[PDB]
C-alpha cells in the first residue's frame, strides 16, 4: 500500500554447535528499525533507525519478552518439523516466517501477510481472507490442524487489523521526516571505452529512497530494453539505494543515446545523456 510494516523471522537449528538460533528484524517500508538475535552477547531488542529510539524502556522490555519467548517456541517448532519429515537430528534446518500489514489510503488495513517457509520452500501461509490457510504438503497440514484448533488465524487477524496497523501509524508519525519523504536519486552518466570500436555508457542513480526505481537506455527515443545491462538495486549503507544501467555503443553514435529515470520522488521522468568533458 502507501506504507507497510514487516517482520522477518529466521530460526535455524545447528546440531552439535548449540541450541537453535532466532533472529528477527523489523521494517517499515525499506527501513529496518529493530533487530533481535538470540546469540548476541545479551539477547535483547536493538534499534536500527534513529526515530525508534524515542520509545521508552517499557517498549524495549516488551519486545524482548516477546522475542525471548519466540526463541523457545521456534526451538520446539524445528524439532516438530524434523519429526514430520523424518529428518536426522544431525542436519541443520531453517524456518523462516514473514508477516506484516499494508496501510491503505484511508489509514486502515489493506492487506495482512503471514507466510512460512521450511528450508527455503513454502510451508504454510495465511490466505488473503485472513481466516484460512494454504498448506504446501501433508506435513504442513499437521500444522494447519494444530493452528485451526488453537484458532491462530483469529489471533493473527486481530493483530494485523489492529495492533499492526496501530503501531505502523505511530512509527510513521515518529519518523515522519524520513519515512514519508521520497528521496530522488543523484544521477550522472559515465563513459568507459572497451575497445577503439565500442564503449560502455553507464547511467547512475545514487542515494535514492525508496528502492523502487526504473532505469532505461534509449537510442533515438527507442527503448533498448534488449541490450541494457542492469544491476540489482543495492543498499548504499546509509538507508539509501544505488543502481546503474549500462549499454554498449559504437564510437561516435553515443550522441544518439539518452538515459530515462523513473522514481516516485521525481515530478516526472528524467532524461539525461553523457556530456563529454
Amino acid at each position: 500500500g502507501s506504507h507497510s510494516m514487516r517482520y522477518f523471522y529466521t530460526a535455524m537449528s545447528r546440531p552439535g554447535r548449540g541450541e537453535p538460533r532466532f533472529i528477527a528484524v523489523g521494517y517499515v517500508d525499506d527501513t529496518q528499525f529493530v533487530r533481535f538475535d538470540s546469540d548476541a552477547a545479551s539477547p535483547r531488542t536493538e534499534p536500527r533507525a534513529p526515530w525508534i529510539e524515542q520509545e521508552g524502556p517499557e517498549y524495549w522490555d516488551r519486545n524482548t519478552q516477546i522475542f525471548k519467548t519466540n526463541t523457545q517456541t521456534y526451538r520446539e517448532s524445528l524439532r516438530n518439523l524434523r519429526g514430520y519429515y523424518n529428518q536426522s537430528e544431525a542436519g541443520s534446518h531453517i524456518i523462516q516466517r514473514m508477516y506484516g500489514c499494508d496501510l491503505g489510503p484511508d489509514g486502515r488495513l489493506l492487506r495482512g501477510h503471514d507466510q512460512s517457509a521450511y528450508d527455503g520452500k513454502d510451508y504454510i501461509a495465511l490466505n488473503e481472507d485472513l481466516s484460512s490457510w494454504t498448506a504446501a504438503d501433508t506435513a504442513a497440514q499437521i500444522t494447519q490442524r494444530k493452528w485451526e484448533a488453537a484458532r491462530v488465524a483469529e489471533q493473527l487477524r486481530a493483530y494485523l487489523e489492529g495492533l499492526c496497523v496501530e503501531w505502523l501509524r505511530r512509527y510513521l508519525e515518529n519518523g515522519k521526516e524520513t519515512l514519508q519523504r521520497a528521496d530522488p536519486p543523484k544521477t550522472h552518466v559515465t563513459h568507459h571505452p572497451v575497445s577503439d570500436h565500442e564503449a560502455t555508457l553507464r547511467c547512475w542513480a545514487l542515494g535514492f529512497y525508496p528502492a523502487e526505481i526504473t532505469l532505461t537506455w534509449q537510442r533515438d527515443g527507442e527503448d533498448q530494453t534488449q541490450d541494457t545491462e542492469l544491476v540489482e538495486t543495492r543498499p548504499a549503507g546509509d538507508r539509501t539505494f544505488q543502481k546503474w544501467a549500462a549499454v554498449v555503443v559504437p564510437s561516435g553514435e553515443e550522441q544518439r543515446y539518452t538515459c530515462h529515470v523513473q522514481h516516485e520522488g521525481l515530478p516526472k521522468p528524467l532524461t539525461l545523456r553523457w556530456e563529454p568533458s
Binding site: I66, I124, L156
Partner: peptide, 9 residues
Amino acid sequence: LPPLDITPY
C-alpha cells in the same frame, strides 16, 4: 510491535 508467537508448528 510483533505478535506473541505462542503456538508451535
